[PDB]
Amino acid sequence: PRAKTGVVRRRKHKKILKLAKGYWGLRSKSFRKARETLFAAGNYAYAHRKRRKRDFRRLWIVRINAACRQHGLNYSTFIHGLKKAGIEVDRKNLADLAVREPQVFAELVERAKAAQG
Amino acid sequence: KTYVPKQVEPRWVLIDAEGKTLGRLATKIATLLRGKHRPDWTPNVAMGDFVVVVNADKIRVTGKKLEQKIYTRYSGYPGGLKKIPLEKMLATHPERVLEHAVKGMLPKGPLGRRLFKRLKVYAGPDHPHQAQRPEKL
Amino acid sequence: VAYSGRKIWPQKHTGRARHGDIGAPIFVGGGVVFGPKPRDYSYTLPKKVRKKGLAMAVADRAREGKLLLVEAFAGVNGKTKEFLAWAKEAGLDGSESVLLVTGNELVRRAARNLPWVVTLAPEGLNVYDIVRTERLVMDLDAWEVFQNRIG
Amino acid sequence: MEAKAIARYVRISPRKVRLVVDLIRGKSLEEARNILRYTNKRGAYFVAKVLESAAANAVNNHDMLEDRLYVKAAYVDEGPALKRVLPRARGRADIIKKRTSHITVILGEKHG
Amino acid sequence: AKHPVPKKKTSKARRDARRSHHALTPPILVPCPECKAMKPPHTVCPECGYYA
RNA sequence: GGUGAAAAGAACCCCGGGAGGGGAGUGAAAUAGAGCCUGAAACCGUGGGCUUACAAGCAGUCACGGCCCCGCAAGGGGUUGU
RNA sequence: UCGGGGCUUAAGCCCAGCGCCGAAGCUGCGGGUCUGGGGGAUGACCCCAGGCGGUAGGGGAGCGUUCCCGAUGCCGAUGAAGGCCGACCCGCGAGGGCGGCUGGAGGUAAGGGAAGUGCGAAUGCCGGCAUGAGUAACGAUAAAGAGGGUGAGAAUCCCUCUCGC
RNA sequence: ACCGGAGCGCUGUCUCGGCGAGGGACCCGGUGAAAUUGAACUGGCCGUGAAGAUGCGGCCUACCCGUGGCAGGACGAAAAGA
RNA sequence: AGCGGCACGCGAGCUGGGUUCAGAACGUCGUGAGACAGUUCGGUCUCUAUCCGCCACGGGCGCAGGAGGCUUGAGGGGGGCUC
Numbered sequence: 001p002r003a004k005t006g007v008v009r010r011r012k013h014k015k016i017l018k019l020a021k022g023y024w025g026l027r028s029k030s031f032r033k034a035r036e037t038l039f040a041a042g043n044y045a046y047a048h049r050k051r052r053k054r055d056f057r058r059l060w061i062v063r064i065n066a067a068c069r070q071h072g073l074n075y076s077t078f079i080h081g082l083k084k085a086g087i088e089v090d091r092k093n094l095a096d097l098a099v100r101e102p103q104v105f106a107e108l109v110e111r112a113k114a115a116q117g
Numbered sequence: 118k119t120y121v122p123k124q125v126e127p128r129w130v131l132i133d134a135e136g137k138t139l140g141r142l143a144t145k146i147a148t149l150l151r152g153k154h155r156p157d158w159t160p161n162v163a164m165g166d167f168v169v170v171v172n173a174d175k176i177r178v179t180g181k182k183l184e185q186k187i188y189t190r191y192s193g194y195p196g197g198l199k200k201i202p203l204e205k206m207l208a209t210h211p212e213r214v215l216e217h218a219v220k221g222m223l224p225k226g227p228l229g230r231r232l233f234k235r236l237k238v239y240a241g242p243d244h245p246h247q248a249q250r251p252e253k254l
Numbered sequence: 255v256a257y258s259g260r261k262i263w264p265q266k267h268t269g270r271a272r273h274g275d276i277g278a279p280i281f282v283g284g285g286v287v288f289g290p291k292p293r294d295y296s297y298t299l300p301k302k303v304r305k306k307g308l309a310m311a312v313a314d315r316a317r318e319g320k321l322l323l324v325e326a327f328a329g330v331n332g333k334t335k336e337f338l339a340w341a342k343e344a345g346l347d348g349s350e351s352v353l354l355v356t357g358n359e360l361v362r363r364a365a366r367n368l369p370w371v372v373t374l375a376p377e378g379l380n381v382y383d384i385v386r387t388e389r390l391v392m393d394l395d396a397w398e399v400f401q402n403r404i405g
Numbered sequence: 406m407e408a409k410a411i412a413r414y415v416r417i418s419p420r421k422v423r424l425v426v427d428l429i430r431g432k433s434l435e436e437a438r439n440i441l442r443y444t445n446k447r448g449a450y451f452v453a454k455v456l457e458s459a460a461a462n463a464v465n466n467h468d469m470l471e472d473r474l475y476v477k478a479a480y481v482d483e484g485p486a487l488k489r490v491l492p493r494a495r496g497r498a499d500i501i502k503k504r505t506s507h508i509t510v511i512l513g514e515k516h517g
Numbered sequence: 518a519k520h521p522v523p524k525k526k527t528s529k530a531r532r533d534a535r536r537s538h539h540a541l542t543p544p545i546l547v548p549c550p551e552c553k554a555m556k557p558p559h560t561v562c563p564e565c566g567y568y569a
Numbered sequence: 570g571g572u573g574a575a576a577a578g579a580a581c582c583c584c585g586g587g588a589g590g591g592g593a594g595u596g597a598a599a600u601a602g603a604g605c606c607u608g609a610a611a612c613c614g615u616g617g618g619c620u621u622a623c624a625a626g627c628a629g630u631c632a633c634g635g636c637c638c639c640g641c642a643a644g645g646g647g648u649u650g651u
Numbered sequence: 652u653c654g655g656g657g658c659u660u661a662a663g664c665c666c667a668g669c670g671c672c673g674a675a676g677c678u679g680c681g682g683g684u685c686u687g688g689g690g691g692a693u694g695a696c697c698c699c700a701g702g703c704g705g706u707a708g709g710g711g712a713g714c715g716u717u718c719c720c721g722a723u724g725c726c727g728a729u730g731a732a733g734g735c736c737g738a739c740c741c742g743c744g745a746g747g748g749c750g751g752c753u754g755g756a757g758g759u760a761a762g763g764g765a766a767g768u769g770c771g772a773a774u775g776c777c778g779g780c781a782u783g784a785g786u787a788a789c790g791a792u793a794a795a796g797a798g799g800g801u802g803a804g805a806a807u808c809c810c811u812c813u814c815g816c
Numbered sequence: 817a818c819c820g821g822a823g824c825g826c827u828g829u830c831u832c833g834g835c836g837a838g839g840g841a842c843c844c845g846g847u848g849a850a851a852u853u854g855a856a857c858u859g860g861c862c863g864u865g866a867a868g869a870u871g872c873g874g875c876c877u878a879c880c881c882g883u884g885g886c887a888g889g890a891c892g893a894a895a896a897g898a
Numbered sequence: 899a900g901c902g903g904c905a906c907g908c909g910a911g912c913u914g915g916g917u918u919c920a921g922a923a924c925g926u927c928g929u930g931a932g933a934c935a936g937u938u939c940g941g942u943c944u945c946u947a948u949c950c951g952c953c954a955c956g957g958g959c960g961c962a963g964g965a966g967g968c969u970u971g972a973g974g975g976g977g978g979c980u981c
């Protein structure tokens with residue numbers, strides 16, 4: 001029994017080509033170029049996925065530190081007060097309170113300045 | 118999901134330069150050029166205050182510096198490397214020395230330039246008395 | 255393959271690839287690599303196993319209750335319509351596939367053209383045919399033959 | 406409505422005639438006849454040929470008003486190329502494609 | 518062939534961009550006084566003639 | 570190597586020197602029109618949406634934002650500015 | 652040019668202290684798979700602890716292609732195969748399915764059998780089509796010009812005159 | 817029409833280049849190849865890295881697209897190093 | 899009448915005298931075929947530049963109303979000899 005190639009190759013190809021729609025030039029037209037690009041893409045995503053967290057942690061910090069700065073103290077000491085005052089609550093994300101509901105951030109500042117000494 | 122600010126208004130600031138240590142001042146100037154002090158900070162927007170500097174011709178700088186310390190420009194041509202000491206910079210256009218400091222302190226991207234334009238430096242005192250002249254130190 | 259052994263080109267400073275002759279399997283129209291040759295697929299199954307199977311088939315078919323020894327083939331003389339009558343009055347409504355084993359040549363002819371019936375001489379008893387069919391019907395005499403081999 | 410007309414298998418390179426077509430896309434039938442009337446390219450003759458036929462079709466087949474129709478769109482497509490062998494130096498030889506075109510012009514009524 | 522050769526197939530983008538300035542201009546024409554017809558400026562044209 | 574069940578293979582009119590088309594007509598289908606069944610990809614082109622002329626690039630990826638588009642609607646698709 | 656800007660009781664060097672930042676390490680929450688150990692009489696299933704970077708390579712479990720039995724069967728013009736499209740469902744994945752469009756005559760469950768069974772690279776083979784590019788070239792530097800004619804169309808065909816070899 | 821040395825005559829071989837002629841190159845109309853080509857959104861310096869970077873780092877520079885030219889680089893093309 | 903770097907800069911710029919193919923000979927070594935860094939005469943160097951770089955020249959758009967003319971000079975280049 002002879003088993004020609006037939007549908008098989010074309011179909012596995014069209015799949016990848018779908019995944020590559022949108023890529024520049026030959027990179028979204030040539031199967032061989034498409035796969036290669038995808039290889040890179042997949043790896044990037046998985047690694048940017050890891051970074052994404054590490055990214056926002058940073059953004060938050062600056063915004064927090066910005067609000068702490070105008071409020072007298074700095075980020076370093078602010079966290080310490082909070083970490084000491086047992087207020088593990090504020091996850092550095094939810095310290096977006098600095099942006100909106102500042103009176104609450106303010107309340108949270110004295111709690112930290114209190115825990116200082 | 119984290120807060121994104123909308124179209125806000127730039128806070129025009131005014132800093133007196135004379136007396137201030139060159140690099141030290143530039144650092145703060147840079148920070149103001151980005152948000153980084155406003156708790157709604159957003160890394161991809163351009164929201165830093167419009168810093169205005171005056172009396173830049175009177176920036177202080179430790180050590181020998183002025184005598185030594187030299188700025189180098191490079192023309193494309195052979196030998197095209199020019200070298201100019203801090204001394205002669207102030208002799209002529211001096212606002213340069215502060216600019217070249219704040220510029221080198223901004224991020225190198227297309228955004229970096231947008232911000233570098235918000236920095237207005239003058240030999241001072243005096244300048245475009247547009248709106249806000251919020252003294253700052 | 256019917257080509258010449260001639261080397262297609264020099265294989266040096268030609269700048270082309272590197273080849274021997276059109277016959278080679280990397281060539282289109284060339285020869286096949288490990289394509290099929292003619293061969294014997296048969297083997298010699300242990301006779302004792304062949305027997306057991308024949309028994310277990312008949313047996314399996316007997317436990318189901320679909321086995322049926324007969325004799326009174328009143329519908330002899332090769333004629334389908336006649337055999338139809340006989341099967342009618344015998345519970346073979348043609349609803350179930352029947353392996354009709356018998357030596358009677360005329361009974362054979364009759365049931366033969368029926369789509370639901372596989373005729374068969376007693377010597378031809380084989381587990382395959384047995385299993386293909388739902389019901390098993392066989393001449394008493396033929397059951398003696400089956401018995402001779404195993405019984 | 407709109408009136409089509411196509412001349413297929415025109416023995417000329419597509420890239421070449423295409424230069425002429427783009428010259429009259431959207432233009433009114435009037436300035437068009439003129440633009441070809443005095444364009445200095447071989448493609449003119451062919452594009453004019455199909456353009457004028459498009460007109461005839463438009464009126465003799467779709468009651469369209471001649472002095473009221475323009476080039477709603479037009480385009481040229483590549484047909485099967487004629488490959489020929491060109492003897493070269495040192496015995497080398499190569500094929501040259503005498504390409505070919507499919508010129509479509511589709512007219513349309515002005516307004517209403 | 519001999520000596521200089523292209524290092525890479527020029528992209529679809531590069532080719533067409535080069536052909537930026539390929540587009541030809543339409544002829545310049547003016548209506549002659551004699552007929553309502555069109556003619557290239559500074560040129561006598563058949564189906565009309567000239568005022569001597 | 571392949572029109573179609575059948576040649577019924579497109580009369581006649583129109584533009585054209587012709588080729589080739591547009592009407593008409595045949596057929597179940599003409600996107601079955603004659604190298605004619607299905608007709609994938611590279612490749613070429615027309616239209617439309619998003620986008621681009623101070624910007625340094627394995628061409629992506631993560632985020633946010635704008636425009637366009639599908640469910641009036643909480644959603645999703647395309648695009649790409651940073 | 653210390654990575655740069657830039658820094659001088661320092662943003663340098665040394666001694667001491669407190670706090671913060673920070674990796675895919677560790678924690679939390681959810682999920683997967685393997686192994687061990689527990690109940691489940693029970694097949695199912697749940698609970699607990701632990702392991703899961705990987706080239707050569709060994710082992711295990713699957714996906715799809717052609718063909719055979721299942722076929723005097725079943726699906727098919729109320730549209731088979733194949734094609735194009737999807738933001739939908741199922742699967743860890745290879746894939747499977749559904750919907751829309753095209754297509755127009757075949758297809759082959761469950762369960763098993765047999766192989767010409769899966770391609771991205773071999774300066775691979777065959778075919779198609781691109782790039783260089785409207786580029787080089789149009790093949791002897793003996794040479795042409797004009798009028799008239801023919802024709803859908805003429806520098807290039809015919810005729811006449813003039814010039815040249 | 818062998819290889820070495822010298823001298824006379826004469827000269828763009830040269831000091832040292834200039835002008836002119838024709839045939840190409842250039843522009844328009846007609847026809848229209850090739851080797852090469854992982855894909856390209858393809859800059860400089862100083863470093864770095866398999867020790868010789870458009871692709872890594874830092875810094876500098878740079879509006880988008882071409883046409884005629886030059887040949888330093890793409891360890892340029894060609895030939896699975898003679 | 900400087901020395902050195904730049905693939906002892908530079909052959910997709912040229913040359914090809916030297917070196918390092920096949921011819922031939924002297925000396926020389928080898929029975930020999932041949933050989934030597936010992937010499938000697940002869941000996942085919944590839945029309946088309948895609949990208950970067952470079953010399954020049956344009957098209958596009960930009961410069962918050964549009965246009966004509968005259969300009970400022972940031973930045974860059976040339977020049978710098980000597981008896």
Ligand SMILES: [Mg+2]
Binds near residue numbers: 004005
């Ligand atoms: Mg295969």
Ligand SMILES: [Mg+2]
Binds near residue numbers: 024025026029
């Ligand atoms: Mg493309």
Ligand SMILES: [Mg+2]
Binds near residue numbers: 029
């Ligand atoms: Mg494509």
Ligand SMILES: [Mg+2]
Binds near residue numbers: 057092
């Ligand atoms: Mg954190």
Ligand SMILES: [Mg+2]
Binds near residue numbers: 144148
């Ligand atoms: Mg600071």
Ligand SMILES: [Mg+2]
Binds near residue numbers: 188216217218221
């Ligand atoms: Mg500076």
Ligand SMILES: [Mg+2]
Binds near residue numbers: 160224226
């Ligand atoms: Mg930044």
Ligand SMILES: [Mg+2]
Binds near residue numbers: 225
């Ligand atoms: Mg950087």
Ligand SMILES: [Mg+2]
Binds near residue numbers: 225
């Ligand atoms: Mg820059």
Ligand SMILES: [Mg+2]
Binds near residue numbers: 256257258
């Ligand atoms: Mg033969």
Ligand SMILES: [Mg+2]
Binds near residue numbers: 255256258
């Ligand atoms: Mg043979």
Ligand SMILES: [Mg+2]
Binds near residue numbers: 256257258259
């Ligand atoms: Mg033979």
Ligand SMILES: [Mg+2]
Binds near residue numbers: 258259275277278
């Ligand atoms: Mg052979």
Ligand SMILES: [Mg+2]
Binds near residue numbers: 259
């Ligand atoms: Mg042989």
Ligand SMILES: [Mg+2]
Binds near residue numbers: 261
């Ligand atoms: Mg041989």
Ligand SMILES: [Mg+2]
Binds near residue numbers: 262276
């Ligand atoms: Mg042969």
